[PDB]
RNA sequence: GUCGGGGGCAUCAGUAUUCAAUUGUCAGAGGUGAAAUUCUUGGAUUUAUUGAAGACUAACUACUGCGAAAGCAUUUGCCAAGGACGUUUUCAUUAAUCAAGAACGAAAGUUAGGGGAUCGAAGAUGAUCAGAUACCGUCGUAGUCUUAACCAUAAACUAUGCCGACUAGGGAUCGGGUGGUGUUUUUUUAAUGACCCACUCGGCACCUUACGAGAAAUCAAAGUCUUUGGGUUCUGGGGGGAGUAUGG
């Protein structure tokens, strides 16, 4: 068809972002290894470069096919932290804009959740 | 590590026959060495999309479909329904600073031997006539709505069956039983119907519909 | 205040004031001699009842208790003091 | 055919929003050809595309945040440098991560980020070139990538504890070579 | 009649949490300011499905509501009391505090058990360069959660013992009581509910000119005290030495 959707993560986070591009299923992750192909650096990844770059691990894997639509999907931690679509998550949304492959959902997969269980920490500070 | 080269067709999914749109596209499976990883991958599946391509509608209804895929018929899946959420994008855009959240749940054991767990949730209402900040219920009128919504998700289930419930939800036929039988506590406003839980089949019968086949 | 003896106020002006309260005190209610729908014989209830009144004649429950003041069942004739 | 995103409103921010339209489309409806529909009752930020209003690849990507970057309590003037570099991105907060915070503790650490009439928002707005908004526990920045890396290491030690000018005399140990 | 995240005994749901398996997989992630600590071609980590445990009910969550205090936020059934309010019901002073005496008691800690999910004072590791500073990171016995019991410590603070008197001045609150030839969905203009205008007592608050104070920040009580006395209980006498020695 023309428009045959698949579905594309974004998995916002800090210090890398993954990719994981198989259409609809759980099964085989077809243009997917991980997205964090594309430094040569210890940790430059949450910047757009392993990042913005990891979309374009995909931009040849996707059309191993030929599909021109997806569901993007933004995608948080999924466990206490903070959980946003932050600066390595908006590149996944950037990349599959400028490399065709079409703009789908929005669920953010994540608990704004019901419990909290004890955090990573002590009385004196957790994150920065 | 078993074959890694002829892992490569397209197999579409048809909806479940009450919607509109059966075709909605084709998929790469991977299984030509036995058809029970074939069946496996097709016996069981969520496989959530909007309901703006079922029914039709510019929403993406906001209910989404758990849409348990059933049977092969030969490039082409027979299917029924399997449940339904609210995606945060509305369930989130309405919680006021001063409003108050009505909660219920019903579990029972409906009909096929299935045991659906409705989730419906209900909000307070700025009243037309209101000009109090607020709308808090007199907190016995708290437990007054979310006893007398109690019956209404007990008798909807105990009457219908499998296809009928989708299909009391396009004008919401439910919100009919809600809003003229426990409108009489309290005013409410952008109440709904949560989630469709078909999570206990306790019976899981053998499988061959012919009925639903779209 | 400034030049009026408190026998000689604006008078209603603290007489819904919580009785007590008032120049001297006074109580808030009042009593009712109405007659039933069964009999017709004056069956005084207390304003604010808190008794549910058998007919005497009938068994129905001709009112029912609220605080406040009571509920009575409709079919009492009122009249004045 | 049809091709669409979509986005509601948060109800405290519709009140922002409902006396902020008046020109958010002449900057976005004039140069970017589309029609978004606002209304009272159903909160739908509607905005979607065809292949006649021109679907080539980045045009879809930047500009519903000149409205989706609005409603996170920014302006209209900060968000349009999305269509200015690749390396422009937002960050959003969740106060209680910090620490487990509780009660007036969470009210006597964050008048120390604003700090006295601004004196401390003004100071990390000279800092980091960023516009940070406090609601209630939103925190919002759209920095570019390395200033909010000196932004989430601007509130290192707002919060948890460090005197504020001590942002600036202590801090200053990491304020100085602002690896 | 209300009221009720009040307290207690069972049931019970949640986003999911991490842990466990199936299942999908095919060469990177991990932090911190640079960095240093680990898993996997005998399948990584971003996938799809079912359980144990605990947590708290996230947003609605405040000009909050309650409870002796410590305290308490999702349902349902169960148990008394309380708080408010109404009453032309009953005792007719049964009363206030409090030497002695007795209950309760956060966090932490103390014995004997249950789980052993979560992080994690100590600790075992990697740090890592002189004390840009040692903030980092990873596992973690006990502990956090409970059961039969202690302990009797807080900035247990609104830094203000408890019963009295009056005054300001307010728009709301919440718990009760009322209905304007009072306004609309509709019981039928003011019904379920909720309203403008008024009125009452209960709890939580606010800010004004400060009459009164205070040395002063400020306080409608930290007042009515040199114009010194409504009732009652426990403390303080310069700093230390010192809440130390000694004894009970």
């Known amino acids: 068809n023309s428009q045959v959707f698949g579905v594309a993560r974004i998995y916002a986070s800090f210090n890398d972002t993954f990719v994981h591009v198989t259409d609809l299923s759980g099964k085989e992750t077809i243009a997917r290894v991980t997205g964090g192909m594309k430094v040569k650096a210890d940790r430059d990844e949450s910047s757009p470069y392993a990042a913005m770059l990891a979309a374009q691990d995909v931009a040849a894997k996707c059309k191993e096919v030929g599909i021109t639509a997806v569901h993007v999907k933004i995608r948080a931690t999924g466990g206490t932290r903070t959980k946003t679509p932050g600066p390595g998550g908006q590149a996944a949304l950037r990349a599959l804009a400028r490399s065709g492959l079409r703009i789908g959902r929005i669920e953010d997969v994540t608990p704004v959740p019901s419990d909290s269980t004890r955090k990573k920490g002590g009385r004196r500070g957790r994150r920065l | ?214 | 205040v400034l030049v009026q003896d408190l026998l000689h106020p604006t008078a209603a002006s603290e007489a819904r004031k919580h009785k007590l309260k008032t120049l001297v005190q006074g109580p808030r209610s009042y009593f009712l001699d109405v007659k039933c729908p069964g009999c017709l014989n004056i069956t005084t209830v207390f304003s604010h009842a808190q008794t549910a009144v058998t007919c005497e004649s009938c068994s129905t429950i001709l009112c029912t208790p609220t605080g406040g003041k009571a509920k009575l069942s409709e079919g009492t004739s009122f009249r004045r003091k | 055919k049809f091709e669409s995103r979509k986005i509601m409103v948060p109800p405290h921010r519709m009140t922002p929003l409902r006396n902020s339209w008046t020109k958010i489309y002449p900057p976005l409806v004039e140069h970017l050809k589309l029609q978004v529909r606002m209304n009272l009752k159903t909160k739908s930020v509607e905005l979607r595309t065809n292949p006649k209003f021109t679907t080539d690849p980045g045009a879809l990507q930047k500009g519903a945040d000149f409205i989706k970057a609005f409603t996170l309590g920014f302006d209209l003037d900060d968000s349009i440098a999305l269509l200015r570099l690749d390396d422009l991105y937002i960050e959003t907060f969740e106060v209680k991560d910090v620490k487990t915070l509780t009660g007036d503790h969470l009210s006597r650490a964050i008048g120390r980020i604003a700090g006295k009439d601004g004196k401390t928002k003004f100071a990390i707005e000279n800092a980091t070139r960023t516009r940070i908004v406090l609601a209630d526990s939103k925190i919002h920045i759209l920095g570019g990538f390395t200033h909010i890396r000196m932004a989430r290491e601007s509130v290192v030690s707002l919060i948890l504890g460090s005197p504020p000018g001590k942002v600036y005399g202590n801090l200053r140990t990491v304020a100085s070579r602002l690896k």
């Open chain 2, 1 to 214: 590590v078993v074959d890694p080269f002829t892992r490569k067709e397209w197999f579409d999914i048809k909806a479940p026959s009450t919607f509109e749109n059966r075709n909605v596209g084709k998929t790469l499976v991977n299984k030509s060495t036995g058809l029970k990883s074939a069946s496996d991958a097709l016996k069981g599946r969520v496989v959530e999309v909007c309901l703006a391509d079922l029914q039709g509608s510019e929403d993406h209804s906001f209910r989404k479909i758990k849409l348990r895929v059933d049977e092969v018929q030969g490039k082409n899946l027979l299917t029924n329904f399997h449940g339904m959420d609210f995606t945060t994008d509305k369930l989130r855009s309405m919680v006021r600073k001063w409003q108050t959240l009505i909660e219920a749940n019903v579990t029972v054991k409906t009909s096929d031997d299935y045991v659906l767990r409705i989730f419906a949730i209900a909000f307070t209402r700025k009243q037309a006539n209101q000009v109090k900040r607020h709308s808090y219920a007199q907190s016995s009128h708290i437990r007054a709505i979310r006893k007398v919504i109690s019956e209404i998700l007990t008798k909807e289930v105990q009457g219908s069956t499998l296809a009928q419930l989708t299909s009391k939800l396009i004008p919401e036929v439910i919100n009919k039983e809600i809003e003229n039988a426990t409108k009489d506590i309290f005013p409410l406003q952008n109440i709904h119907v949560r989630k469709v839980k078909l999570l206990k089949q306790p019976k899981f019968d053998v499988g061959a519909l012919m009925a639903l086949h779209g």
